[PDB]
Ligand binder design. Structure first.
Ligand code: ZN
Lengths: 51, 64
């Protein structure tokens, strides 16, 4: 009436919960790159010679 | 701290164009047009007002 060893298991199942990968879009930056410093339009000379 | 009285390199007196400069900037004028309308021709004078930091207004805020 006691507990005895039974037949060895024939296989093992290991369960884990996993989600999946999306598409590669690689959206690097809101406003991207190093935007260049640049000329103010027209500007004009702010200096003249004497005479 | 407070506006220099005379431009350092030349000596031109710029200590009376501080309030006029502030008034022309409140009216919508660029710093270039503003410095022109004040008579600051050579850039040695223009740097004297363009790059002035008025720290007398921040010291004049702690108790007497
Ligand atoms: Zn000067």
């Amino acid at each position: 009436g006691g507990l005895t060893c039974a037949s060895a298991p024939q296989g093992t199942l290991r369960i884990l919960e996993g989600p999946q990968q999306s598409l590669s879009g690689s959206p690097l930056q809101p406003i991207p790159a190093s935007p260049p410093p640049q000329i103010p339009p027209g500007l004009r000379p702010r200096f003249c010679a004497f005479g | 701290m407070i506006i220099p009285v005379r431009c350092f390199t030349c000596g031109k007196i710029v200590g009376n164009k501080w309030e006029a400069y502030l008034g022309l900037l409140q009216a919508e004028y660029t710093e270039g047009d503003a410095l022109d309308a004040l008579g600051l021709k050579r850039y040695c004078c223009r740097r004297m007002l363009l790059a002035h930091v008025d720290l007398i207004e921040k010291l004049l805020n702690y108790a007497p």
